[PDB]
Amino acid sequence: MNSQELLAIAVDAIDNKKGEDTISLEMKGISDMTDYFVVTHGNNERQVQAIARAVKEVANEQNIEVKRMEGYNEARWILIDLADVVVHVFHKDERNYYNIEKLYQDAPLESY
Amino acid sequence: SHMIQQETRLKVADNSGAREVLTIKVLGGSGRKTANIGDVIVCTVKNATPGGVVKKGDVVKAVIVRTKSGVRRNDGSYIKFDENACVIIRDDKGPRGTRIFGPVARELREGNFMKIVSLAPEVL
């Protein structure tokens, strides 16, 4: 599959665990490392860990290898590299600190 | 023009408050004393910016993100940078700061520093 339908899958998994304020950024013009950045958050450290696992699971289930999970234990910012698509899961109180959206304020943003 | 080892000074390339560190130890199971891109080091903050979270004298870990004695890719490409630079990191490898300054080498993604990659303006 192509990154667009991989994107579509990841946001479904995120919406499944009630991911808040979930957005995607098109990184094609802006980066060689990936095509999309997904940004979403949860309200507690369990929900951020669950949204991450949900992204892993629904990506396994279609046989995509989650390449790495970063900061899964601490559950503040969990980065799930699917390579074509990179999913950032943030604790509610951490998202605004990093403000990924405003760092790439010229990337095509889509919200859900 | 020379490699990174104990007692070598490095610019900090993030908003952590640290501006310049002093290496005290290269980490890594090889026990070897050279650090390059993607290596974690221990260092003491020798210069800091007022109002930052990280203050002079603190002991921190940092990942090397630019080396002026560069490394060669699987590609046969050899990349180099004009300066040595690192990024202060937490224990789980997430950046202490929230912003990265200048170019970082793409090896960080394989190092599991993909958070630093995602914040960096330029990836070489």
Numbering used by the authors:
A (entry chain A): 1 to 112
B (entry chain C): -1 to 122
The authors write:
RsfS is a stationary phase protein that binds to the ribosomal protein uL14 on the large subunit (50S), and subsequently prevents its association with the small subunit (30S), thus tuning down translation during stress. Unlike HPF, the mechanism of stress response mediated by RsfS is conserved in bacteria (but it is also found in the mitochondria and chloroplasts); nonetheless, the knowledge of its mechanism of action and interaction with the ribosome is very limited. In this work, we uncover the binding mode and describe the detailed interactions that the stress protein RsfS establishes with the 50S ribosomal subunit in S. aureus using cryo-electron microscopy and X-ray crystallography. Experiments on 50S–RsfS complex formation under different magnesium concentrations proved that RsfS does not promote subunits dissociation, but rather functions as an anti-association factor.
To interpret the binding of S. aureus RsfS to 50S ribosomal subunit in more details, we solved the crystal structure of RsfS bound to its interacting partner uL14 at 2.3 Å resolution. Expression and purification of individual proteins were prone to aggregation; thus, we co-expressed, purified, and crystallized S. aureus uL14–RsfS as an entire complex. Importantly, the primary contacts between amino acids such as Arg97, Arg107, Lys113 of uL14, and Glu70, Asp81, Tyr98 of RsfS are conserved across bacteria. In our crystal structure, Thr96 and Lys113 of uL14 indeed interact with RsfS; however, they form only a few H-bonds, thus unlikely representing the most crucial interacting interface. We speculate that such differences at the solvent facing side of RsfS are probably due to the fact that this region is, to some extent, flexible in solution, but stabilized in crystals.
